[PDB]
Swiss-Prot record, chain A:
GO MF annotation, one: translation initiation factor activity
Organism the protein comes from: Saccharomyces cerevisiae (strain ATCC 204508 / S288c)
One of the GO BP terms on file: regulation of translational initiation
Protein's UniProt name: Translation initiation factor eIF2B subunit delta
Origin: domain of life: Eukaryota
Keywords of the record: Acetylation, Cytoplasm, Initiation factor, Phosphoprotein, Protein biosynthesis, Repressor, Translation regulation
Free-text function comment from the UniProt entry: Acts as a component of the translation initiation factor 2B (eIF2B) complex, which catalyzes the exchange of GDP for GTP on the eukaryotic initiation factor 2 (eIF2) complex gamma subunit. Its guanine nucleotide exchange factor activity is repressed when bound to eIF2 complex phosphorylated on the alpha subunit, thereby limiting the amount of methionyl-initiator methionine tRNA available to the ribosome and consequently global translation is repressed.
Main location: cytoplasm
GO CC aspect terms: cytosol; eukaryotic translation initiation factor 2B complex; guanyl-nucleotide exchange factor complex
Curated annotation (Swiss-Prot), chain B:
Similarity annotation: Belongs to the eIF-2B alpha/beta/delta subunits family.
Subcellular location: Cytoplasm, Cytosol
Subunit structure: Component of the translation initiation factor 2B (eIF2B) complex which is a heterodecamer of two sets of five different subunits: alpha, beta, gamma, delta and epsilon. Subunits alpha, beta and delta comprise a regulatory subcomplex and subunits epsilon and gamma comprise a catalytic subcomplex. Within the complex, the hexameric regulatory complex resides at the center, with the two heterodimeric catalytic subcomplexes bound on opposite sides.
InterPro entries: eIF2B_beta_subunit (IPR051855), IF-2B-related (IPR000649), IF_2B-like_C (IPR042529), M1Pi_N (IPR027363), NagB/RpiA_transferase-like (IPR037171)
Signal peptide: none
PANTHER family: TRANSLATION INITIATION FACTOR EIF-2B SUBUNIT BETA
Protein name: Translation initiation factor eIF2B subunit beta
Record GO cellular component, one term: mitochondrion
Superkingdom as given in the UniProt entry: Eukaryota
UniProtKB/Swiss-Prot annotation, chain C:
Assembly mode: Component of the translation initiation factor 2B (eIF2B) complex which is a heterodecamer of two sets of five different subunits: alpha, beta, gamma, delta and epsilon. Subunits alpha, beta and delta comprise a regulatory subcomplex and subunits epsilon and gamma comprise a catalytic subcomplex. Within the complex, the hexameric regulatory complex resides at the center, with the two heterodimeric catalytic subcomplexes bound on opposite sides.
Described function: Acts as a catalytic component of the translation initiation factor 2B (eIF2B) complex, which catalyzes the exchange of GDP for GTP on eukaryotic initiation factor 2 (eIF2) and is regulated by phosphorylated eIF2. Its guanine nucleotide exchange factor activity is repressed when bound to eIF2 complex phosphorylated on the alpha subunit, thereby limiting the amount of methionyl-initiator methionine tRNA available to the ribosome and consequently global translation is repressed.
Single GO MF annotation: translation initiation factor activity
Phylogenetic classification of the source organism: Eukaryota, Fungi, Dikarya, Ascomycota, Saccharomycotina
Keywords: Cytoplasm, Initiation factor, Phosphoprotein, Protein biosynthesis, Translation regulation
Ranges in a coiled coil: none
Protein name, entry field: Translation initiation factor eIF2B subunit epsilon
One Gene Ontology biological process: regulation of translational initiation
Chief place of localization: cytoplasm
Cell location: Cytoplasm, Cytosol
Domain of life: Eukaryota
UniProtKB/Swiss-Prot annotation, chain D:
Gene it is expressed from: GCN3
SUPFAM superfamilies in the cross-refs: NagB/RpiA/CoA transferase-like
Pfam families: IF-2B
Organism: Saccharomyces cerevisiae (strain ATCC 204508 / S288c)
GO MF term (any one): translation initiation factor activity
Role of this protein: Acts as a component of the translation initiation factor 2B (eIF2B) complex, which catalyzes the exchange of GDP for GTP on the eukaryotic initiation factor 2 (eIF2) complex gamma subunit. Its guanine nucleotide exchange factor activity is repressed when bound to eIF2 complex phosphorylated on the alpha subunit, thereby limiting the amount of methionyl-initiator methionine tRNA available to the ribosome and consequently global translation is repressed.
Cellular component aspect of the GO annotation: cytosol; eukaryotic translation initiation factor 2B complex; guanyl-nucleotide exchange factor complex
Alphabetical UniProt keywords: Acetylation, Activator, Cytoplasm, Initiation factor, Phosphoprotein, Protein biosynthesis, Repressor, Translation regulation
Family (UniProt): Belongs to the eIF-2B alpha/beta/delta subunits family.
Gene3D superfamilies, per database record: Translation initiation factor eif-2b, domain 2, Translation initiation factor eIF-2B, N-terminal domain
Remarks, miscellaneous: Present with 8970 molecules/cell in log phase SD medium.
Single GO BP term: positive regulation of cellular response to amino acid starvation
InterPro entries in alphabetical order: eIF2B_alpha/beta/delta, elF-2B_alpha_N, IF-2B-related, IF_2B-like_C, NagB/RpiA_transferase-like
Protein name from the UniProt record: Translation initiation factor eIF2B subunit alpha
Amino acid sequence: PGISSVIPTVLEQSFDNSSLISVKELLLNKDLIHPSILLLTSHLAHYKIVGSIPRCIAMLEVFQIVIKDYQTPKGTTLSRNLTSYLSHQIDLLKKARPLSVTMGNAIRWLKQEISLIDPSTPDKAAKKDLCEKIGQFAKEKIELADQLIIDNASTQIEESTTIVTYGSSKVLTELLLHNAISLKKNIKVIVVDSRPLFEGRKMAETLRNAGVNVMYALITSLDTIFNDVDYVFLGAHSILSNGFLYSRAGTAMLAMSAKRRNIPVLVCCESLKFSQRVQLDSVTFNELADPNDLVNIDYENPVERRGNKGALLNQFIKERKFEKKKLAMENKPKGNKIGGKKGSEGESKDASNEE
Amino acid sequence: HPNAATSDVNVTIDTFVAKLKRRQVQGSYAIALETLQLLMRFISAARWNHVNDLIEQIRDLGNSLEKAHPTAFSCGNVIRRILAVLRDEVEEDTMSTTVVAEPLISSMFNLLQKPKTDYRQVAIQGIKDLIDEIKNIDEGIQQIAIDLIHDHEILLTPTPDSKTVLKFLITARERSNRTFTVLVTEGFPNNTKNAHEFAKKLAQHNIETLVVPDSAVFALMSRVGKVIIGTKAVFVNGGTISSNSGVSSVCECAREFRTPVFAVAGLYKLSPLYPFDVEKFVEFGGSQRILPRMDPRKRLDTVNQITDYVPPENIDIYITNVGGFNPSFIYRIAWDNYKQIDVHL
Amino acid sequence: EDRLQAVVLTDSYETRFMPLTAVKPRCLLPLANVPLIEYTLEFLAKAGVHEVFLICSSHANQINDYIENSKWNLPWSPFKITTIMSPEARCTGDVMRDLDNRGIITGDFILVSGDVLTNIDFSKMLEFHKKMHLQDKDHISTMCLSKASTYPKTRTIEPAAFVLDKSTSRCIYYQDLPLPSSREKTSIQIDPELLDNVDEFVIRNDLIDCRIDICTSHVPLIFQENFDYQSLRTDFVKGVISSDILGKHIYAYLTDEYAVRVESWQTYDTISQDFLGRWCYPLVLDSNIQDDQTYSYESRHIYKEKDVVLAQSCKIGKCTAIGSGTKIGEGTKIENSVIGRNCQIGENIRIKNSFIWDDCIIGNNSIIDHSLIASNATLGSNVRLNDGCIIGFNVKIDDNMDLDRNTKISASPQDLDDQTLAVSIVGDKGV
Amino acid sequence: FNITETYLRFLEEDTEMTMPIAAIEALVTLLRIKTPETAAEMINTIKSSTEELIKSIPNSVSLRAGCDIFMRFVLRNLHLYGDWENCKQHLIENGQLFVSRAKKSRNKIAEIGVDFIADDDIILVHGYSRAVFSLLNHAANKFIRFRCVVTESRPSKQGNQLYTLLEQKGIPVTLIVDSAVGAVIDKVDKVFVGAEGVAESGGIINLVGTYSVGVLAHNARKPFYVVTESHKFVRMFPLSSDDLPMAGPPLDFTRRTDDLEDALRGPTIDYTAQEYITALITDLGVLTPSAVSEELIKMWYD
């Protein structure tokens, strides 16, 4: 069935809103789960590349594989044990890593498609049309929509400009790659990074592989790099009903500085990224991770040192707690580039009612 | 003036110069102690008989010392401190050799009205008093500082590097009537090791320790009671140069959330110099500690800086051995210890 | 543990730098507007040297005069410099026998071939040398090594492969390979005499040579005994390993931090770019070691000394350094390039990845890309240069001149094209 | 037949019939001659004439916005798959009906937007618009007490023009310079501003000093107004504080001169963010912030 309860590190006096636990190394499980799910859960547990956008694309493709592998039983119909099996997938995904908003909209789309198709049509004729529709759905809402974001941003950015970024957002990597190659401008790109994940490092590496003038920096040193900077792009995860920017770690700090130092913040987003859940502070619902990623002393992810820190459980109160997903304040960002072209974050939910 | 005259008699000049340039000497407190012992050796060994020739020679020695190392403000201040102690006793001595000198208070306005002894012994004792002052600052801080922080209040701390601030925090935790939660920003490229030792010493005394990544500062600012700075050097306008990394953003984060900012310092740490530009005063770090491999470092031009500056717009109190002062007043505390001429050496 | 004497191998890698070393010596040349010897001497002072030796023969008078002017002739210095004068151009083995005949070597001495800039603390090295000397009696010399830039695909001049112990860190084999530049040889033959004595064999090519040595009193006696050995690495180390005297050991030291010996032009270019960057944390221009230096750090890795004069509306790049008493005209682009002290620069000049030493005048409307200029040499108007184009001393290039890739110019007024006098072989001129 | 020439003919005319509504009336006249039945022959030549109009523009935004609304209405005509003749006749007629709608909207606003000016309130007015002055005149017609402060706007000396047009009514005034405009926000009850354009975000496209007014008022906590006719909406999103469509200079720095000729150059059109506007007034009800964007989403259907 799975492993539940018994967690590493202290329960903590401050910040205990979410689960801090889960299965990394495979021991005691059901022998019916599709291995492509088991691969993705093992991926997302210790992932370095993904950040909101790519997670759903992989989740869709895994689902497409499952349907292609799905053969309808002779006794039980198509809508009998499928939805239970999908619920087992999501529960295993939840155990590995808390889901994104875009993942939820995908599940909601899939559950709508199950109800749409009645058990009367032949099995091979059904799944052939289904995967074709999902492919077209992923083409429209992601790939084509992404291209629409590309060209919307293209008109907005001035010739020969300096851009500071953060994260590992798929949309922005392709944005800057488009700027360097197709448009041919003088784009100075500065990338910032945190401690838990070297997301920006990977982005800078990929930008270097394209051949871009790249500076690479950290949160600690900003009042030096800014004093240069024009437009700041932020990797969206979810924009809520109010218009608060729920995104990764070192995002809000950058957002504040940019608002203070004249030239503002811009955000690229998808029409699938918007939710209806609302909050106002970072404490509300945080994506907490185990302090195992913060054990390492600088430089790289695997170093293995006999350093200063090591104990967490036996130590009399030593909460080395880090967070992953934060909230930028409402007023600070200015532009959102989506499927429906443009709109300020003050407007926010003009897409949720438009559907 | 060169070191050609002071070579066989005074050797320790050049060993301190060597300690600065290669950074063998560490922490402003230690730099001050060395310069004190330098001036101790200068008076004890030299022969002068004349006073004005002596003072101007000391001025040139201090000028060369600050040119040898720009981040050694504690070096520059200690010399300037003794210079003024000298100058007052000379002005007192000249009044007796000639023969109201007491208008109201101890003012300024040097642009208005015009103008053997135990002077050397006073110079000796003047060094001794400076040492004892640097030896005991904590006693003068704790009587002003441990009056401002309350129970169930959360304290966020950039710069865990300061020996001064940690010892101030431990004296407050000694009081069983006072309870506080400590958040500590890591300061990745430099402070990391020091921040981890800071978190260890807080757990050693059993104080609620919370280690914070430099990204998460915003994600907590709504919950923060107070902000405390472990500064290295304090200035005329109020502002501070602190012991490395992740302070400026934290102070910017505090001001936006209107969270109070505290600073713990000494008068020897306090400087009469003015920071007209941060560009000159701040020292930059080594990018080697960020990213490995040199063939990608052709394209990876990484930026890292040690010392961090805070403008006076953020901090509100500078609790010293004397007392608590506002940034809009700290200049007077400075002029009470250093003269106007004793700036441009 | 105290009292340490050092010997510096100068007059060693001359003419390895092809267009230069004609009038002035090898080590006089500036890396960052300051002589290469000064870096080495700073390394000596940080290590803790009490007595300094130097090997000068070719252009020895200019070396001796530079030491006279140096900061170490003055009495307060921790070390005193004594120069060894030998016959013109000889191998390292010949100098070793000369020094043993004179007999000044006491206990543990230091030998450095070439000039090396490193941020690595030597106090740790001395301790581990002494700890390993106390392990067994017949132990000889110490070698330094540092980790390379992941893959040494651009590094062709130093193809040294090292076989090392995991437990004792003893070197087993040294081998040079033409591999990527000349695809001819593939094979490497290793002696199987030390198979079960070591067991934990580790073969690496991903290590940079340093040629910095801590040596015992045995070394000069061995050189006189075996006078067939000319080199100190290629034949000597291999000779020591391959049962010359049974039971004798030599060290190999691994260090994570930056340590690169200067040898070639394109290695020199990388080290210089590393110095402009913050690779060598202590060794930075702003600290000022030569005392006359007044460099100040500016954000985005831009270095400026005191008395820097610059025209308005001019753009500066990344990892750049400009000397004192320097004037620049309008419309100038300075990107990843070093310009020396007292250098006057004209107008509308685009510079990328290039090099200019002290006291150089550049004519108006000229583009210079990844190419080097020596001291007291003048560039004319309309000058276009390509990658790896090294220009010699006092070379006056006249107006309207175009030069392609790797066009080296001679410093002495022999066999290669372009000389020192006006219109350098664009119309036959030159002595 | 020309469209730029028809717009140039309005010299001594203007007022009531607004600049964009005269450009829309010029668009309808060009449409009705060369057969509006063909959607291939006509719409492409309409697009070329708008492109020629944009190329002839020196410093105007609203003409580009007014074309869009026209286009939209034309496309919406035959949305019901109606007779290709009755739908055409309704399209040609909606040209004179469009200009007649500028009258009806002004009749609506001047009775709605007089409510904001309360009993005895000192007003500081900046950026002259036909809607804001129509509020000011029809409040004097309502016999209500209000004081007025003139701002010295510098595009083509607009402050003096505004001052003279206030004199022809019977309302006490005095000249205040835009430099000293900070020293007035304590004796002024409310600040009114007429717009040249309203953003997709909710910000404003305006004259030679309006952002400066917006910020100072935000500091002084005194209200900041936008009053206009509902046709000045473009699908425009100025990302930064200094980015706008221009035919002239985006801040030029000139060389050393002695005769004194090259000097004036400064940002003649400036943007202000959404936060600075307290209230907005149009004929489309009483609405301010996201309302503008909703309108634009409703039009563009995207």
